[PDB]
Design an enzyme around this catalytic site. Structure first.
Site, PDB file in Angstrom:
ATOM      1  CG  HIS B  14       3.247 -31.581   2.637  1.00 59.21           C
ATOM      2  ND1 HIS B  14       2.366 -32.001   3.614  1.00 59.21           N
ATOM      3  CD2 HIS B  14       2.385 -31.141   1.504  1.00 59.21           C
ATOM      4  CE1 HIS B  14       1.270 -31.529   3.287  1.00 59.21           C
ATOM      5  NE2 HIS B  14       1.124 -30.878   2.308  1.00 59.21           N
ATOM      6  CE  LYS B  17       3.843 -38.963   2.801  1.00 57.81           C
ATOM      7  NZ  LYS B  17       3.749 -39.729   3.701  1.00 57.81           N
ATOM      8  CE  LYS B 250      -0.534 -34.194   1.803  1.00 55.47           C
ATOM      9  NZ  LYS B 250      -1.777 -33.851   2.417  1.00 55.47           N
TER      10      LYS B 250
HETATM   11  C1  MTA Z   1      -1.876 -24.055   0.107  1.00 55.84           C
HETATM   12  S1  MTA Z   1      -1.283 -24.821   1.885  1.00 55.84           S
HETATM   13  C2  MTA Z   1      -1.161 -26.398   1.706  1.00 55.84           C
HETATM   14  C3  MTA Z   1      -0.002 -26.992   1.064  1.00 55.84           C
HETATM   15  O1  MTA Z   1       0.497 -26.376  -0.033  1.00 55.84           O
HETATM   16  C4  MTA Z   1       1.895 -25.840  -0.095  1.00 55.84           C
HETATM   17  N1  MTA Z   1       1.974 -24.433   0.137  1.00 55.84           N
HETATM   18  C5  MTA Z   1       1.979 -23.576   1.279  1.00 55.84           C
HETATM   19  N2  MTA Z   1       2.209 -22.435   0.787  1.00 55.84           N
HETATM   20  C6  MTA Z   1       1.858 -22.429  -0.658  1.00 55.84           C
HETATM   21  C7  MTA Z   1       2.060 -21.312  -1.458  1.00 55.84           C
HETATM   22  N3  MTA Z   1       2.329 -19.926  -1.178  1.00 55.84           N
HETATM   23  N4  MTA Z   1       2.201 -21.692  -2.831  1.00 55.84           N
HETATM   24  C8  MTA Z   1       1.746 -23.060  -3.232  1.00 55.84           C
HETATM   25  N5  MTA Z   1       2.002 -23.932  -2.297  1.00 55.84           N
HETATM   26  C9  MTA Z   1       1.823 -23.751  -1.143  1.00 55.84           C
HETATM   27  C10 MTA Z   1       2.328 -26.663   1.126  1.00 55.84           C
HETATM   28  O2  MTA Z   1       2.852 -27.837   0.867  1.00 55.84           O
HETATM   29  C11 MTA Z   1       1.216 -26.915   2.102  1.00 55.84           C
HETATM   30  O3  MTA Z   1       1.668 -27.768   3.012  1.00 55.84           O
HETATM   31 MG    MG Z   2      -2.689 -31.353   5.078  1.00 59.68          MG
END
Ligand code: MTA
Ligand code: MG
Ligand code: MTA
Ligand code: K
Ligand code: K
Ligand code: MG
Ligand code: NA
Ligand code: NA
Ligand code: NA
Ligand code: NA
Lengths: 380, 380
Positions: B14, B17, B250
């Protein structure tokens, strides 16, 4: 039966708060032209630098140089002698479109009321009857101390002040059937950036007489109150030069000062589809509606979401024992009176309106009669 | 009598993180050579970029290119097909010395035991007897789901997995005289970045059968449990390319998952003189010592500091009604058994040791028998 509780606040020129204000200035600039802009703007600040990084999909034409520099000007960083200058600092931009994978899963070809949450996450709202505005006294006082510093800086009565400040207030409370009753102020901390010429004794005297006494009711101050005024002894270097700033690093200052709880997500730089902001505002609205409606004296509300799903996954009410009704009964009242889908919250709280920079200092709650601060009349 | 509570966790990839882990890799690299390094390293991540910004004063010679890239390699971002590659990304450095004004007010010409707090602030510790490790079940399970994803990615059994993931667990609890008793898992969310070839049904089946069932005891799962697995429908773009990352975004994942409280300050990238980290670790140690010592089943501890002042300004104990002793009595036990000056905490918790990167994913608490997880035997 008494206990201490401490909260802090920071000023408009604290480097993390600079970033929150810039992120929300960018959001507002987009929303002024495109109410449906998708904005996730992070700001980073260090000596001589503002960097914007994140994701924006918008029909607006935004001059980031102008927007950033105007926000820094308003804060008061306008000369190299202060450590930072809007006229001459570097503004760097690393902004891309919103991920198409996010867009398709959240909002593309969805009815607005049925838009998915823009992310998963959990959020909390809180309200307490200990002040009229339903906020903890500790953080209210801490915010007002920073506001007073900015007032006396801007009106020229303490011209040695600079924009970067921090305050901290410890209150002694009594417990009262789950509610809390402030008794007295136990300790106050104030640290504020200052010019090279003013001496420590002049600053400490001014902070006590012109800041604390102007803000804190005398009934809360006594011979035992402890004052830590300019406790580091010297704070000439400040702003981003003294400490890097980032958006979303003051989330407890932004909310309840340690009271209640927090789900972790930052507010600034995010449009309403990011439930970190919109659902936290709605949860505050619920909590304040329960307290102002007479259903409880103190309450914590949790909500949570999954990306792409409109309705919350969970809703929880914790009333600290301050209601005759059970928490289950309050939850049923909440479910009957509130629709916490983001595409409904946006309508109820008017969250396409470009007022977000106003939220980004001195706390998002307890001020200014924003929509989330106007209680809903509850039917039960 | 039952209620829901939700917590989330995120994976090693992430983007926020990633930044925490890089910041702590930098801290550890300094501490390996200079145990007294003063470190305040923030990291920002976006497509193709890691930026380090902050303040370090240290006798170490650290190769930031190497340290950053090795951390990203370990996380698993090693190819442009995954959205990010340690071998080829940009590493930018905006690091300066610690402000001399801070240094003189905090630590210069001070006896180590009497070093001042490196900042003002408030911090909380929390412990709950609902698990052996004294952590909330919601976040323990959420962390373990992310760890399982990383395990199955690294062992090649789900080779379509990428490092960026988020999980969220809602548990139904019963109240028990202030303590909480988990009953069942109400809802699970998992979102994880994946390759372009694998279909949604294959992913959802694997997430249920190979991730959830491997982690969550069957006794908590039933016909009513709700599963939101890849709820966005597509998550190919991920890591910093999908969402900017920053250190210290976080802080609830790092701590108690919404339970307890938080004072607002981030942990990663900071040496022990930053009480945001050291005093939060000490407060966890106090809370866990009270629960493992049999003095209460659930407890929240607050502490606060002023910059330049060694002893805390306030200490508070909230036991949720789970002790026969009053909160005042517990506070007296804490004051008699713990010295919460930062220059004493550093000795008790061995906080010059370069173990911080290990803390920067999967939560700082409840794992690995770090010093703050080993209860102190209390005299009373
Ligand atoms: C929605 S963006 C915030 C977090 O959600 C996750 N994320 C990013 N893209 C997607 C996606 N297409 N679908 C689900 N979660 C996502 C990633 O961990 C990001 O840091
Ligand atoms: Mg963030
Ligand atoms: C101690 S660095 C963290 C924050 O404390 C403030 N600060 C910076 N320098 C000093 C200083 N010399 N004395 C007191 N507070 C400071 C600034 O608001 C900064 O963002
Ligand atoms: K910082
Ligand atoms: K982000
Ligand atoms: Mg900060
Ligand atoms: Na006092
Ligand atoms: Na949802
Ligand atoms: Na369920
Ligand atoms: Na202190």
């Amino acid at each position: 039966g008494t206990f201490l509780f401490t909260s802090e606040s920071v000023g408009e020129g604290h480097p993390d708060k600079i970033c929150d204000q810039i992120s929300d200035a960018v959001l507002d600039a987009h929303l002024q032209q495109d109410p449906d802009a998708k904005v996730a703007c992070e700001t980073v600040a260090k000596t001589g630098m503002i960097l914007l990084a994140g994701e924006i999909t918008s029909r607006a034409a935004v001059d980031y140089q102008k927007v950033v520099r105007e926000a820094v000007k308003h804060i008061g960083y306008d000369d190299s002698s202060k450590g930072f200058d809007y006229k001459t600092c570097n503004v760097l931009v690393a902004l891309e479109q919103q991920s198409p994978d996010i867009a398709q899963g959240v909002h593309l070809d969805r009815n607005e009321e049925d838009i998915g949450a823009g992310d998963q996450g959990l959020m909390f709202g809180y309200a307490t009857d200990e002040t009229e505005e339903c906020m903890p006294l500790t953080i209210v006082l801490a915010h007002k101390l920073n506001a007073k510093l900015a007032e006396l800086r801007r009106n020229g009565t303490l011209p040695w002040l600079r924009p970067d400040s921090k305050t901290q207030v410890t209150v002694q409370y009594m417990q009262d059937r789950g509610a809390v009753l402030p008794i007295r102020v136990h300790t106050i901390v104030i640290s504020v950036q200052h010019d090279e010429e003013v001496c420590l004794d002049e600053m400490r005297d001014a902070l006590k007489e012109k800041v604390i006494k102007a803000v804190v009711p005398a009934k809360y101050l006594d011979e035992d109150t402890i004052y830590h005024l300019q406790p580091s002894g010297r704070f000439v270097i400040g702003g981003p030069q003294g400490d890097a700033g980032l958006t979303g690093r003051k989330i407890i200052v932004d909310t309840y000062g340690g009271w209640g709880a927090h789900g972790g997500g930052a507010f600034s730089g995010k449009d309403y589809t990011k439930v970190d902001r919109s659902a936290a505002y709605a949860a505050r609205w619920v909590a304040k509606s329960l307290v102002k409606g007479g259903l409880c004296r103190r309450v914590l509300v949790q909500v949570s979401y999954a990306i792409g799903v409109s309705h919350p996954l969970s809703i929880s009410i914790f009333h600290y024992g301050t209601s005759q009704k059970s928490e289950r009964e309050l939850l049923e009242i909440v479910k009957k009176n509130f629709d916490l889908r983001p595409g409904v919250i946006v309508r109820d709280l008017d969250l396409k309106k470009p007022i977000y920079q106003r939220t980004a200092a001195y706390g998002h709650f307890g001020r200014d009669s924003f929509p989330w601060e106007v209680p809903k009349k509850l039917k039960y």
